[PDB]
Amino acid sequence: IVKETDNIPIYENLGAGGTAEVTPVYLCGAQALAVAYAKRWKTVTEEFDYGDK
Amino acid sequence: IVKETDNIPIYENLGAGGTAEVTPVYLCGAQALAVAYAKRWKTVTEEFDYGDK
């Protein structure tokens, strides 16, 4: 399954003669990346400046 | 009654020839020191930087 992802970087000066632009394509399967969470994303609120901010 | 207190300072190079070390011994009777307590020791807690600190 080939997926169109806009965030893949493009590198300059790595091509033939230094003019061409190089892009990577990543073919992954199971157990490709590992994300470890010591604390999941959380939202907190605080008051500042005598409760004005 | 002579008591050893580990925190009596030793002063460097105050002896003969600028090399020996000098230490004080304190002999105390009644009404030696006065301690005034406007407020005793208290423990407080605070949170800073959106709870980070």
Side-chain angles (χ1 to χ4, degrees):
Chain A
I1 311 172
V2 183
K3 306 204 176 195
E4 171 146 50
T5 58
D6 192 31
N7 309 126
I8 298 270
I10 295 189
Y11 309 97
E12 164 67 42
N13 211 348
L14 291 180
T19 62
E21 277 93 311
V22 181
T23 198
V25 179
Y26 301 120
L27 177 67
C28 317
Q31 300 153 12
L33 292 148
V35 183
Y37 282 105
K39 173 185 151 263
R40 291 212 152 232
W41 286 110
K42 197 141 61 53
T43 302
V44 290
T45 45
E46 177 136 348
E47 286 234 72
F48 303 89
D49 198 282
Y50 291 95
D52 170 51
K53 320 252 188 265
Chain B
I1 308 100
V2 182
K3 307 180 175 189
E4 58 187 312
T5 45
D6 307 340
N7 302 274
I8 294 277
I10 294 182
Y11 306 108
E12 183 144 2
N13 294 335
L14 289 193
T19 307
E21 337 285 332
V22 181
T23 184
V25 180
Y26 301 121
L27 176 81
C28 307
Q31 305 147 8
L33 310 151
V35 184
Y37 275 110
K39 148 188 156 189
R40 301 239 177 205
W41 292 108
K42 285 311 179 323
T43 321
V44 317
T45 61
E46 195 146 89
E47 307 213 358
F48 314 86
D49 201 330
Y50 290 101
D52 176 32
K53 327 252 185 260

